[PDB]
Symmetry: C3
Subunit: 124 residues, 3 copies
């Protein structure tokens, strides 16, 4: 089992069964009650049959005052292209400045749901 | 394995599929208007019997905030296999960060199934 | 499998059908003003099974009851957080003024196997 990882550029902090920390790819300022898609400066080829889940770090709110608007991000195995870079969708509850290289979220991989049949019924 | 799905009514967009394997999109069952900094339980128009020993996880779609300006106040919904009755309909708990209108049929969240955790015994101890 | 659990004190409400997520409770009364934040103690520390983690989300009724969201979306607690002072908390942002009482059920957890060991291999292109 391998993940192939491409970084946006040579300035990106390279990554360390624990969840894996992802970092801002550039300095980003967000005003209170505004939204920004924060680049994470990585693109990955996940193992066949897997998906990645991304959540904030426990410390992200205290450090940065942002929440992740999609709650948990899901990245499918198919999102493996050269320009398929990842982003963190940040809504700021206070004025904030996030710096290049600061840890803001974390990810793990999980096996995709097995194939299931959705069958319509009139009554449960 | 199969999920049995009951729609609220005839106007709900069907998601019936054989061999479905990636997260499954869920839709607003009616038009809903939500005013900035208010909350609405958005019906999704579906009730399901999940395979035995499974649960469902429900999160926003990646585009939900961009399109509709809402967050899901429970973070991730957990729907147990026992929630399988004829009126056990599913809802998206929406908190609006801007004035928004969601229309019947708009894809607002997504789900997958997961096996439920193993039997676990909690043993109280005086120190770790 | 076994989870060893230590409570903060005798005043904590002790914590369940097979596989259901397990409710966690406020360790003290907590008042939060609208648009403010508080780390709500849960009053429990645990030794999770080897190779597992815990995931913590709000209960479905948390927002209706208490007007709060969980700022880290889903908390992840690794097996290594098993020490005698490794207590759990729920990071609550209040969207309306609110009051949580000691013993109120506010979030829920399950265990999950940790991801497999995987090699992260840097490449120049995909």
């Amino acid at each position: 089992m391998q993940i192939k990882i491409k970084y946006l550029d040579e300035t990106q902090t390279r990554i360390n069964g624990d969840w894996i920390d992802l970092r801002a790819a550039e300095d980003v300022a967000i005003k209170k009650d505004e939204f920004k898609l924060v680049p994470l400066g990585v693109a990955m080829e996940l193992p066949e049959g897997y998906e990645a889940h991304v959540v904030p770090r426990s410390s992200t709110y205290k450090n940065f005052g942002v929440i992740q608007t999609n709650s948990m991000g899901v990245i499918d195995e198919s999102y493996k292209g050269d320009n398929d870079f990842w982003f963190f969708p940040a809504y700021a509850l206070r004025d904030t400045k996030i710096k290049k290289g600061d840890r803001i979220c974390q990810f793990r991989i999980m096996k995709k749901m097995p194939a299931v049949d959705l069958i319509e019924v009139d009554r449960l």
